[PDB]
With several copies, the nearest count.
Chain A
Amino acid sequence: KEIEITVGYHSDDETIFKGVVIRQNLKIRNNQSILIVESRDMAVKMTLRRKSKYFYELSDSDILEELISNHGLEADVASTENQHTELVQYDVTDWDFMMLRLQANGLLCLVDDGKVSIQKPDLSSEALETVTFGATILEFDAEMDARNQLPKVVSQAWNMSDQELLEKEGVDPSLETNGNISSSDLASLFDQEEEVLRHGGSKKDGSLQEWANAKWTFQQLAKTRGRIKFQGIPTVKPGVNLLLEGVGDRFNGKVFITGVNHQISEGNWTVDAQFGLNPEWFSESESNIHT
């Protein structure tokens, strides 16, 4: 069955979630008896069956749109410059295949109310609101870690036409983040040698250049990470910016939101906002991708 959840103050409600019911659980204890109901968005359709397919003269964004439309989902996907002549999907789900291909190009996936949106990070937009330590914050957690910064990144592959290696250096995007310590001050602290991304086969230049660039961008977005808890509103969603104040020069500034948790119970509505990215890739941290 289809479910929709709305919430607000004094009957000024707004929609928070849309999806489909999947599970039903019962629990009985000495003086307690409850029912728990779980639901997910429609995107869940893409995680159920392993497939095999040959693709032909398509860009990665043409492939991403195809994978999504196959399940009747709405899509909005940023374009790419490269075009493959053949690409093979083998014994994997559509969701997993999509994630691997999307990271390789520096893109983030945002799923919301039945629509799948694939875009580059946007650190330029206006903050929605200001959250302040001495006035509005209920809870706060933050971390800085120098081992995540790199001095430079280069990628390699074999050039069969020339009989030598193909090397490409990335480009430093100089992302604008919070705090007052440069990623370039942290990068030089322990080891000034370059990071090398290696592949043993034959690659196109366009692919190698994007790979090195995606790696570097994702590490800068992992520079400062944390959680902010405050009184709930219906507008904070992954992919927005907030202004953080009163927590010291090391952390103050504009922060990019990567996750949201809404909790409604016992008289109040609160929201946990998450900022910063985890530097790990899908292919490194997730289990059971392969048979």
Chain B
Amino acid sequence: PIEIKELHIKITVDDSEDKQQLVAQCVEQVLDVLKSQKER
């Protein structure tokens, strides 16, 4: 994103940060789809 408005706070789980990178990609592609729908 080109905006700091769309970043989320990072919380990891001590289960023993691969899953942190996958969730961050899904938030990026959703908000690009929502922005393209308001184009003429």
Interface residues, chain A, CB within 8 Å of chain B?
A: 31-32, 34, 44, 47, 95, 141-143, 225-227, 259-261, 263, 265-266, 272, 274, 276, 278, 287
Known: A47-B40, A95-B40, A287-B38. A265 touches B10 (CB 8 A): yes
Tell me what chain B mostly uses at the interface: helix, strand, loop, or mixed. loop
Q: Is the CB of A263 within 8 A of B10?
A: yes
Q: Is the CB of A226 within 8 A of B2?
A: yes
Interface residues, chain B, CB within 8 Å of chain A?
A: 1-5, 7, 9-13, 15, 17, 38, 40
Q: Is the CB of B40 within 8 A of A274?
A: no
Q: Is the CB of A272 within 8 A of B7?
A: yes
Tell me what chain A mostly uses at the interface: helix, strand, loop, or mixed. strand
Chain A neighbourhood of B11, CB < 8 A: 34
Q: Is the CB of B2 within 8 A of A143?
A: yes
> Which of A142, A260, A261, A263 lies in contact with B2, CB distance below 8 A?
A142
Chain A neighbourhood of B38, CB < 8 A: 287
Q: Is the CB of B4 within 8 A of A274?
A: yes
Q: Is the CB of B4 within 8 A of A261?
A: yes
Chain A neighbourhood of B10, CB < 8 A: 263, 265-266
**B31, chain A: closest CB distance, angstroms:** 13
**B22, chain A: closest CB distance, angstroms:** 14
Chain B neighbourhood of A141, CB < 8 A: 1-2
> Which of B1, B12, B15, B17 lies in contact with A227, CB distance below 8 A?
B1
Q: Is the CB of B13 within 8 A of A227?
A: no
Chain A neighbourhood of B13, CB < 8 A: 31-32
Q: Is the CB of A225 within 8 A of B2?
A: yes
Q: 10 additional contacts, CB 8 Å, given A31-B15, A32-B13, A259-B5?
A: A47-B40, A142-B2, A226-B2, A227-B3, A259-B4, A261-B4, A266-B12, A274-B4, A278-B3, A287-B38
